């Protein structure tokens, strides 16, 4: 099938104010549902959801991506690849009901942006206009990366998402958030201590901790530290590859640089496959609840 073009179309009669209200609803629920996942909260899984849905994109034929907001998950979340994502969709359901006018793609991606900012991460410019395509569903089957691979696999995989070395290393820093859950992915443990605060801890831990490759309770190999942290083989490959290593060191020593690069890469990820008209509104930069005194 000929490559389809997806033009961003602003939800009829909606403006910045409307989306800030959605952002606020998401942010308020993040604050309210504080007990989820042993008090980590829904922040991490929402970021994962935004990445996963956008990560289905294929630059070659512009299939997948965040635009359509319509997907079919393998085994309906009963697969090591997508298990756990249902928690994010469940969290967003009440938000969508309160704001039925927002497209699914806009909601899923906005959920990630809101989560990163509320967790004290960098501001992520975000654009509206994704249009639901119920007639065009994108199966996630084999489109997201395996975690038991090396640096060459990671580099090649991300080329499909049009990401270079710096973009890949920056995006991976999101693993400072949340944790792996054995029953979900066959991996267990957090990557750091501040599981729900967005910082460059991922890089510091990679370089500073004493890691040991071991099999977990699912018989899968992962790198463990005495501090109680873990790294997937794909995470660890970032310090095994010399080109990735230099960038990990850069981010480990410059919090501001990491924030700026992550912001650019994350927005790009969430916008891959979308064509924005020259007269489309400028990207929205939402204020956090804190900045609004809410
Ligand atoms: C080589 C690429 C990647 C691989 C192999 C990978 C793999 C995984 C795996 C196995 C989990 C654990 C799922 C679970 O057990 O619940 C996970 C969680 C997560 N990933 Fe990644 N990931 C990759 C890239 C990314 C990127 C680029 C982002 C976002 C910018 C991201 C954000 C997250 C977050 C925030 C979590 C924690 C979710 C939670 O705590 O519920 N991942 N990822």
Tab-separated table of C-alpha atoms and ligand atoms in Angstrom:
chain	number	residue	atom	x	y	z
A	1	UNK	CA	0.000	0.000	0.000
A	2	UNK	CA	1.204	3.489	-0.922
A	3	UNK	CA	2.673	5.472	2.011
A	4	UNK	CA	-0.185	7.319	3.702
A	5	UNK	CA	0.162	10.935	4.833
A	6	UNK	CA	-1.221	11.928	8.226
A	7	UNK	CA	-2.010	15.619	8.526
A	8	UNK	CA	-2.557	16.933	12.035
A	9	UNK	CA	-6.101	18.249	12.404
A	10	UNK	CA	-6.836	20.326	15.501
A	11	UNK	CA	-9.838	19.044	17.451
A	12	UNK	CA	-12.653	21.334	16.329
A	13	UNK	CA	-12.809	24.526	18.370
A	14	UNK	CA	-10.090	23.463	20.803
A	15	UNK	CA	-7.167	25.625	21.895
A	16	UNK	CA	-4.276	25.642	24.362
A	17	UNK	CA	-6.617	26.249	27.313
A	18	UNK	CA	-8.563	23.072	26.563
A	19	UNK	CA	-5.465	20.893	26.470
A	20	UNK	CA	-4.016	22.427	29.642
A	21	UNK	CA	-7.251	21.336	31.327
A	22	UNK	CA	-6.677	17.776	30.096
A	23	UNK	CA	-3.059	17.973	31.259
A	24	UNK	CA	-4.322	19.153	34.645
A	25	UNK	CA	-6.835	16.316	34.894
A	26	UNK	CA	-4.088	13.783	34.196
A	27	UNK	CA	-1.735	15.495	36.649
A	28	UNK	CA	-4.383	15.615	39.368
A	29	UNK	CA	-5.160	11.908	38.967
A	30	UNK	CA	-1.429	11.127	39.090
A	31	UNK	CA	-1.347	12.898	42.444
A	32	UNK	CA	-4.513	11.146	43.680
A	33	UNK	CA	-3.758	7.530	42.702
A	34	UNK	CA	-0.534	7.502	44.723
A	35	UNK	CA	-0.583	3.862	45.871
A	36	UNK	CA	-0.245	2.232	42.462
A	37	UNK	CA	2.693	-0.161	42.049
A	38	UNK	CA	3.834	0.039	45.677
A	39	UNK	CA	3.579	3.831	45.728
A	40	UNK	CA	5.594	4.460	42.582
A	41	UNK	CA	2.435	5.931	41.091
A	42	UNK	CA	1.237	5.876	37.475
A	43	UNK	CA	3.871	8.270	36.154
A	44	UNK	CA	6.294	5.652	34.803
A	45	UNK	CA	3.732	3.402	33.129
A	46	UNK	CA	2.182	6.437	31.398
A	47	UNK	CA	5.581	7.369	29.962
A	48	UNK	CA	6.043	3.758	28.874
A	49	UNK	CA	2.596	3.802	27.258
A	50	UNK	CA	3.410	6.950	25.293
A	51	UNK	CA	6.697	5.448	24.121
A	52	UNK	CA	5.204	2.074	23.272
A	53	UNK	CA	2.336	3.467	21.201
A	54	UNK	CA	4.621	5.867	19.318
A	55	UNK	CA	7.328	3.215	19.049
A	56	UNK	CA	5.154	1.158	16.710
A	57	UNK	CA	6.072	3.588	13.933
A	58	UNK	CA	7.938	2.505	10.796
A	59	UNK	CA	9.567	5.330	8.815
A	60	UNK	CA	9.559	3.190	5.664
A	61	UNK	CA	5.786	3.146	5.094
A	62	UNK	CA	4.595	5.497	7.842
A	63	UNK	CA	2.563	2.760	9.515
A	64	UNK	CA	2.054	2.813	13.267
A	65	UNK	CA	3.055	5.768	15.387
A	66	UNK	CA	0.941	7.934	17.675
A	67	UNK	CA	-1.288	9.454	14.987
A	68	UNK	CA	-4.077	6.889	14.685
A	69	UNK	CA	-4.344	6.096	18.380
A	70	UNK	CA	-5.691	2.719	17.273
A	71	UNK	CA	-3.805	-0.463	18.182
A	72	UNK	CA	-4.217	-4.207	18.676
A	73	UNK	CA	-1.916	-5.600	21.352
A	74	UNK	CA	-0.606	-9.159	21.116
A	75	UNK	CA	-2.429	-11.570	23.438
A	76	UNK	CA	-4.340	-8.524	24.683
A	77	UNK	CA	-1.565	-7.538	27.112
A	78	UNK	CA	-0.809	-11.176	27.950
A	79	UNK	CA	2.597	-11.088	26.271
A	80	UNK	CA	6.018	-10.225	27.779
A	81	UNK	CA	6.232	-7.395	25.243
A	82	UNK	CA	3.171	-5.376	26.272
A	83	UNK	CA	2.111	-6.804	29.646
A	84	UNK	CA	1.463	-3.968	32.071
A	85	UNK	CA	0.427	-1.331	29.546
A	86	UNK	CA	-3.219	-2.008	30.394
A	87	UNK	CA	-2.673	-0.132	33.664
A	88	UNK	CA	-1.913	3.032	31.714
A	89	UNK	CA	-4.945	2.667	29.477
A	90	UNK	CA	-7.138	2.066	32.532
A	91	UNK	CA	-5.739	5.207	34.155
A	92	UNK	CA	-6.549	7.282	31.076
A	93	UNK	CA	-10.105	5.974	30.659
A	94	UNK	CA	-11.732	8.349	33.164
A	95	UNK	CA	-9.728	11.216	31.669
A	96	UNK	CA	-11.071	10.445	28.200
A	97	UNK	CA	-14.604	10.314	29.591
A	98	UNK	CA	-14.238	13.770	31.132
A	99	UNK	CA	-12.840	15.082	27.835
A	100	UNK	CA	-14.493	12.966	25.108
A	101	UNK	CA	-13.446	15.464	22.423
A	102	UNK	CA	-9.732	14.647	22.581
A	103	UNK	CA	-8.383	12.070	20.122
A	104	UNK	CA	-6.924	8.845	21.505
A	105	UNK	CA	-3.517	9.587	20.005
A	106	UNK	CA	-3.435	13.010	21.614
A	107	UNK	CA	-4.459	11.528	24.974
A	108	UNK	CA	-1.885	8.725	24.964
A	109	UNK	CA	0.981	11.042	24.017
A	110	UNK	CA	-0.194	13.829	26.319
A	111	UNK	CA	-0.227	11.295	29.140
A	112	UNK	CA	3.496	10.764	28.652
A	113	UNK	CA	4.276	14.470	28.459
A	114	UNK	CA	2.224	15.167	31.594
A	115	UNK	CA	3.892	12.341	33.503
A	116	UNK	CA	7.416	13.484	32.637
A	117	UNK	CA	6.726	17.086	33.632
A	118	UNK	CA	4.857	16.279	36.832
A	119	UNK	CA	7.747	14.033	37.851
A	120	UNK	CA	10.004	17.100	37.606
A	121	UNK	CA	11.376	16.288	34.183
A	122	UNK	CA	11.992	18.773	31.365
A	123	UNK	CA	9.183	20.619	29.645
A	124	UNK	CA	8.174	18.680	26.527
A	125	UNK	CA	6.566	20.784	23.783
A	126	UNK	CA	3.464	18.950	22.590
A	127	UNK	CA	1.249	19.369	19.525
A	128	UNK	CA	-2.392	18.387	19.071
A	129	UNK	CA	-4.075	17.118	15.930
A	130	UNK	CA	-3.718	13.345	15.981
A	131	UNK	CA	-6.828	11.797	14.422
A	132	UNK	CA	-8.371	8.485	15.459
A	133	UNK	CA	-8.279	5.961	12.618
A	134	UNK	CA	-10.557	3.121	13.820
A	135	UNK	CA	-10.488	1.704	10.290
A	136	UNK	CA	-6.687	1.505	10.363
A	137	UNK	CA	-5.416	-0.538	13.317
A	138	UNK	CA	-1.733	-1.124	14.055
A	139	UNK	CA	-0.789	-4.451	15.695
A	140	UNK	CA	2.164	-4.103	18.075
A	141	UNK	CA	3.358	-7.603	17.166
A	142	UNK	CA	7.128	-7.558	16.688
A	143	UNK	CA	7.318	-3.775	16.340
A	144	UNK	CA	8.809	-2.936	19.748
A	145	UNK	CA	12.373	-3.910	20.817
A	146	UNK	CA	13.484	-7.064	22.619
A	147	UNK	CA	15.420	-6.482	25.850
A	148	UNK	CA	17.802	-9.435	25.622
A	149	UNK	CA	19.829	-7.929	22.769
A	150	UNK	CA	23.085	-6.008	22.233
A	151	UNK	CA	24.178	-2.547	21.077
A	152	UNK	CA	24.088	-3.457	17.387
A	153	UNK	CA	20.470	-4.580	17.764
A	154	UNK	CA	19.538	-1.388	19.604
A	155	UNK	CA	21.210	0.851	17.027
A	156	UNK	CA	19.564	-0.917	14.086
A	157	UNK	CA	16.157	-1.072	15.757
A	158	UNK	CA	16.031	2.657	16.404
A	159	UNK	CA	16.941	3.466	12.823
A	160	UNK	CA	13.373	2.420	12.013
A	161	UNK	CA	12.182	5.244	14.295
A	162	UNK	CA	14.673	7.615	12.641
A	163	UNK	CA	16.689	8.026	15.832
A	164	UNK	CA	20.482	8.403	15.913
A	165	UNK	CA	22.959	7.458	18.667
A	166	UNK	CA	22.383	10.565	20.791
A	167	UNK	CA	18.616	10.298	20.456
A	168	UNK	CA	18.679	6.630	21.451
A	169	UNK	CA	20.837	7.239	24.524
A	170	UNK	CA	18.719	10.240	25.556
A	171	UNK	CA	15.441	8.361	25.172
A	172	UNK	CA	16.751	5.414	27.208
A	173	UNK	CA	17.263	7.747	30.163
A	174	UNK	CA	13.540	7.393	30.778
A	175	UNK	CA	14.437	4.118	32.486
A	176	UNK	CA	15.248	6.168	35.554
A	177	UNK	CA	11.462	5.819	35.908
A	178	UNK	CA	9.534	2.876	37.315
A	179	UNK	CA	10.781	-0.685	37.200
A	180	UNK	CA	10.608	-4.016	35.425
A	181	UNK	CA	8.018	-6.452	36.810
A	182	UNK	CA	8.781	-10.168	36.573
A	183	UNK	CA	5.202	-11.187	35.745
A	184	UNK	CA	5.054	-8.521	33.047
A	185	UNK	CA	8.279	-8.729	31.061
A	186	UNK	CA	10.282	-11.515	32.663
A	187	UNK	CA	12.602	-8.953	34.248
A	188	UNK	CA	12.522	-7.687	37.824
A	189	UNK	CA	13.744	-4.594	39.614
A	190	UNK	CA	14.107	-0.796	39.358
A	191	UNK	CA	16.896	0.947	37.455
A	192	UNK	CA	17.424	3.395	40.312
A	193	UNK	CA	16.306	4.830	43.659
A	194	UNK	CA	14.079	7.757	42.653
A	195	UNK	CA	11.781	5.496	40.619
A	196	UNK	CA	9.278	8.446	40.197
A	197	UNK	CA	11.373	11.568	39.821
A	198	UNK	CA	12.802	12.307	36.387
A	199	UNK	CA	16.593	12.744	36.647
A	200	UNK	CA	19.736	11.506	34.886
A	201	UNK	CA	20.134	8.726	37.482
A	202	UNK	CA	19.985	6.030	34.790
A	203	UNK	CA	23.380	7.119	33.439
A	204	UNK	CA	24.965	7.616	36.846
A	205	UNK	CA	23.942	4.116	37.921
A	206	UNK	CA	25.235	2.546	34.709
A	207	UNK	CA	28.663	4.109	35.286
A	208	UNK	CA	28.927	4.051	39.076
A	209	UNK	CA	27.328	0.807	40.247
A	210	UNK	CA	29.038	-2.579	40.408
A	211	UNK	CA	27.072	-4.775	38.017
A	212	UNK	CA	26.888	-8.563	37.832
A	213	UNK	CA	25.149	-10.513	35.073
A	214	UNK	CA	22.759	-13.043	36.612
A	215	UNK	CA	19.639	-15.010	35.732
A	216	UNK	CA	16.437	-13.786	37.386
A	217	UNK	CA	13.451	-15.804	38.620
A	218	UNK	CA	12.276	-16.077	35.012
A	219	UNK	CA	15.634	-17.518	33.895
A	220	UNK	CA	16.425	-14.348	31.955
A	221	UNK	CA	19.781	-12.633	32.225
A	222	UNK	CA	19.936	-9.104	33.595
A	223	UNK	CA	22.589	-6.976	35.277
A	224	UNK	CA	22.149	-6.518	39.032
A	225	UNK	CA	23.863	-4.202	41.509
A	226	UNK	CA	24.169	-4.560	45.289
A	227	UNK	CA	22.156	-1.358	45.649
A	228	UNK	CA	19.199	-3.370	44.398
A	229	UNK	CA	19.117	-1.912	40.891
A	230	UNK	CA	19.000	-3.712	37.566
A	231	UNK	CA	19.783	-3.049	33.921
A	232	UNK	CA	18.384	-4.852	30.894
A	233	UNK	CA	20.945	-6.268	28.462
A	234	UNK	CA	19.894	-3.469	26.089
A	235	UNK	CA	20.484	-0.844	28.795
A	236	UNK	CA	23.893	-2.282	29.611
A	237	UNK	CA	24.834	-2.302	25.916
A	238	UNK	CA	24.995	1.496	26.149
A	239	UNK	CA	28.245	1.209	28.109
A	240	UNK	CA	29.562	-1.777	26.132
A	241	UNK	CA	29.479	0.129	22.829
A	242	UNK	CA	32.156	2.876	22.714
A	243	UNK	CA	29.990	5.392	20.855
A	244	UNK	CA	27.071	4.953	23.253
A	245	UNK	CA	29.441	5.070	26.233
A	246	UNK	CA	30.676	8.573	25.452
A	247	UNK	CA	27.111	9.856	25.343
A	248	UNK	CA	26.165	8.071	28.580
A	249	UNK	CA	29.093	9.847	30.234
A	250	UNK	CA	27.968	13.164	28.773
A	251	UNK	CA	24.467	12.858	30.227
A	252	UNK	CA	25.828	11.495	33.512
A	253	UNK	CA	27.737	14.758	33.859
A	254	UNK	CA	25.260	17.311	32.530
A	255	UNK	CA	21.688	17.186	33.840
A	256	UNK	CA	20.628	20.185	31.771
A	257	UNK	CA	22.024	18.704	28.552
A	258	UNK	CA	20.164	15.460	29.201
A	259	UNK	CA	16.900	17.311	29.867
A	260	UNK	CA	17.206	19.332	26.668
A	261	UNK	CA	18.105	16.336	24.499
A	262	UNK	CA	15.454	14.116	26.051
A	263	UNK	CA	12.815	16.786	25.469
A	264	UNK	CA	13.685	17.044	21.775
A	265	UNK	CA	13.901	13.286	21.246
A	266	UNK	CA	10.676	12.555	23.121
A	267	UNK	CA	8.694	15.161	21.223
A	268	UNK	CA	10.142	13.797	17.973
A	269	UNK	CA	9.158	10.257	18.989
A	270	UNK	CA	5.599	11.369	19.749
A	271	UNK	CA	5.378	13.247	16.447
A	272	UNK	CA	6.937	10.724	14.062
A	273	UNK	CA	4.703	10.150	11.042
A	274	UNK	CA	2.686	13.329	11.546
A	275	UNK	CA	2.647	16.213	9.088
A	276	UNK	CA	1.960	19.598	10.679
A	277	UNK	CA	0.460	22.292	8.407
A	278	UNK	CA	2.432	25.534	8.181
A	279	UNK	CA	-0.559	27.305	9.736
A	280	UNK	CA	-0.947	24.821	12.588
A	281	UNK	CA	-0.753	26.237	16.113
A	282	UNK	CA	2.697	26.476	17.702
A	283	UNK	CA	3.679	23.628	20.049
A	284	UNK	CA	2.054	23.809	23.474
A	285	UNK	CA	4.246	24.037	26.566
A	286	UNK	CA	2.038	23.119	29.508
A	287	UNK	CA	2.484	24.515	32.993
A	288	UNK	CA	2.812	21.963	35.793
A	289	UNK	CA	0.259	21.885	38.598
A	290	UNK	CA	3.002	23.364	40.776
A	291	UNK	CA	3.516	26.269	38.364
A	292	UNK	CA	-0.230	26.944	38.469
A	293	UNK	CA	-0.469	26.727	42.245
A	294	UNK	CA	-2.862	23.792	41.859
B	1	LIG	C1	15.881	-0.828	23.676
B	1	LIG	C2	14.623	-0.175	24.021
B	1	LIG	C3	13.812	-0.498	25.124
B	1	LIG	C4	13.597	-1.716	25.685
B	1	LIG	C5	14.189	-3.069	25.277
B	1	LIG	C6	12.675	-1.522	26.778
B	1	LIG	C7	12.183	-2.533	27.598
B	1	LIG	C8	11.368	-2.346	28.710
B	1	LIG	C9	10.943	-3.390	29.604
B	1	LIG	C10	11.251	-4.874	29.483
B	1	LIG	C11	10.262	-2.799	30.612
B	1	LIG	C12	9.630	-3.459	31.834
B	1	LIG	C13	8.135	-3.665	31.668
B	1	LIG	C14	7.512	-4.286	32.894
B	1	LIG	O1	8.016	-5.346	33.325
B	1	LIG	O2	6.527	-3.718	33.424
B	1	LIG	C15	10.245	-1.383	30.345
B	1	LIG	C16	9.678	-0.433	31.183
B	1	LIG	C17	9.676	0.935	30.966
B	1	LIG	N1	10.205	1.547	29.851
B	1	LIG	FE1	11.476	0.731	28.492
B	1	LIG	N2	12.403	-0.178	26.931
B	1	LIG	C18	13.028	0.453	25.876
B	1	LIG	C19	12.923	1.812	25.592
B	1	LIG	C20	12.199	2.746	26.327
B	1	LIG	C21	12.047	4.136	25.970
B	1	LIG	C22	12.693	4.793	24.743
B	1	LIG	C23	11.222	4.699	26.890
B	1	LIG	C24	10.687	5.996	26.908
B	1	LIG	C25	11.280	7.248	26.480
B	1	LIG	C26	10.941	3.682	27.877
B	1	LIG	C27	10.222	3.873	29.055
B	1	LIG	C28	9.904	2.887	29.983
B	1	LIG	C29	9.344	3.131	31.295
B	1	LIG	C30	9.045	4.515	31.881
B	1	LIG	C31	9.219	1.928	31.906
B	1	LIG	C32	8.689	1.653	33.327
B	1	LIG	C33	7.212	1.238	33.284
B	1	LIG	C34	6.639	0.876	34.650
B	1	LIG	O3	7.310	1.110	35.673
B	1	LIG	O4	5.503	0.355	34.699
B	1	LIG	N3	11.487	2.480	27.479
B	1	LIG	N4	10.922	-1.120	29.172
